[PDB]
């Protein structure tokens, strides 16, 4: 775990998480509700898209670009979803 | 007309998720077309990157040249990337020539 590090989740139809590496439960667990909500609407508009949107999560002293895509083609576990990476830019 | 999207330029990244196997397990359409126009060597430095990935266990960045567009190939490890218990590696692919506005 590194700014080096992306953070990855993987989010099926049912806004289940279906993968997460360390790194995304770290910045999970160490951002505000205001982020989580931003995040949360970024996936929504992911689905509702289904194309790539990118975005700049400002903080106050950290700076995440956040990329999220969506996915049709799911093995088991999902039909379709969004891949979200979070850049820790700083 | 005007719409609701007229200011938005619709951009799409590649996205693969591989697990220990290296069998592909997730996909969108355009990995699926970058697969399917792939050439050999391409495929092989795709392939060396995602095995770096497997042994770093963190994230790597390149640049692969496809069909002579420019691309930057991500790859993130994930410890368990299905219920089942393999390990894995996320993949996204941006198309930097999409990025740039030499084709106007």
């Given at each position: 775990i590194n700014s080096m590090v992306e953070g990855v989740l993987g989010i099926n139809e049912s806004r289940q998480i279906i993968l997460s590496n360390k790194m995304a439960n770290d910045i999970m667990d160490n951002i505000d509700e205001d982020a989580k909500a931003f995040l949360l609407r970024q996936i929504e508009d992911t689905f509702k898209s289904k194309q790539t949107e990118m975005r700049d999560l400002e903080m106050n002293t950290r700076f995440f670009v956040v990329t999220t895509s969506y996915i049709?083609?799911?093995?088991?576990?999902?039909?379709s979803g969004v891949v979200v990476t979070v850049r820790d830019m700083t």
């Amino acid at each position: 775990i590194n700014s080096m590090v992306e953070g990855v989740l993987g989010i099926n139809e049912s806004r289940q998480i279906i993968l997460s590496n360390k790194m995304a439960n770290d910045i999970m667990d160490n951002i505000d509700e205001d982020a989580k909500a931003f995040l949360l609407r970024q996936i929504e508009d992911t689905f509702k898209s289904k194309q790539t949107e990118m975005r700049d999560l400002e903080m106050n002293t950290r700076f995440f670009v956040v990329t999220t895509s969506y996915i049709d083609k799911i093995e088991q576990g999902g039909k379709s979803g969004v891949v979200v990476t979070v850049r820790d830019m700083t």
